[PDB]
Design an enzyme around this catalytic site. Sequence first.
Site, PDB file in Angstrom:
ATOM      1  CG  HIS A   1      -1.764   1.158   1.351  1.00 49.12           C
ATOM      2  ND1 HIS A   1      -1.693   2.022   2.429  1.00 49.12           N
ATOM      3  CD2 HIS A   1      -2.671   1.661   0.487  1.00 49.12           C
ATOM      4  CE1 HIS A   1      -2.541   3.037   2.240  1.00 49.12           C
ATOM      5  NE2 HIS A   1      -3.111   2.826   1.082  1.00 49.12           N
TER       6      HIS A   1
ATOM      7  N   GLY B   1       1.161   5.411   9.601  1.00 46.67           N
ATOM      8  CA  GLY B   1       2.579   5.639   9.344  1.00 46.67           C
ATOM      9  C   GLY B   1       3.475   4.412   9.665  1.00 46.67           C
TER      10      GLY B   1
ATOM     11  CB  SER C   1      -1.093  -5.030   6.385  1.00 47.36           C
ATOM     12  OG  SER C   1      -2.021  -4.687   5.338  1.00 47.36           O
TER      13      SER C   1
ATOM     14  CB  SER D   1       1.911   0.834   6.392  1.00 47.48           C
ATOM     15  OG  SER D   1       0.571   1.157   6.889  1.00 47.48           O
TER      16      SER D   1
ATOM     17  CG  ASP E   1      -0.331  -4.259   2.372  1.00 47.41           C
ATOM     18  OD1 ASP E   1       0.342  -3.611   1.495  1.00 47.41           O
ATOM     19  OD2 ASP E   1      -0.752  -3.658   3.391  1.00 47.41           O
TER      20      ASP E   1
END
EC number: 3.4.21.12
Lengths: 198, 6
Positions: A36, A141, A159, A143, A63
């Site tokens: 993402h 943030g 994720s 991720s 992801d």
Amino acid sequence: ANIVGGIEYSINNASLCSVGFSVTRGATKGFVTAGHCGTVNATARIGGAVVGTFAARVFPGNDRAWVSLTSAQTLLPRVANGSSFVTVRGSTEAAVGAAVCRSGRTTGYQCGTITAKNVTANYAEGAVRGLTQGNACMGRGDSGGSWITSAGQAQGVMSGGNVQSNGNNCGIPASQRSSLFERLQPILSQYGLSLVTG
Amino acid sequence: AAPXXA
């Protein structure tokens, strides 16, 4: 830049994500992160300098992504824990009930346990299947950041989950948190990557 | 659930 799991990077001068793990693909240096976070060829910067671009990603569905870095980057087999570091030793997958910690630029290093595997997240973009759930908190943030055991077995990359209105799930009890990570094993095999270890 | 990112 020194590449350590958990530090911030930006994508196309807009979005923020965290580094998951230093890896190599042959002579190419890279880091694994969340899909993402960017599309193929997006530009990643660390502390304002260009460090590489998105080489591949899958999102939604899965992801995951890896960023190929310039040869000037220094890869390190470490994940940030405050001012300290956790040494990366491999990628054995831990079982449900194991303790695990995650590192990311918003909430720092947070620990909990693995509560379920093979979980589907229905994000607005589409479902992401096969994620592992933990109850360590996280926020906007984090991720792409590392999930690892204290013994140094890298588990996967951040994720998403049930962020509350303050932008994280740290203000709700561990029993109510759903913090999801994409397993690292399939990302290493899908892209032919080797984890940097120490 | 939302991904995340920031």
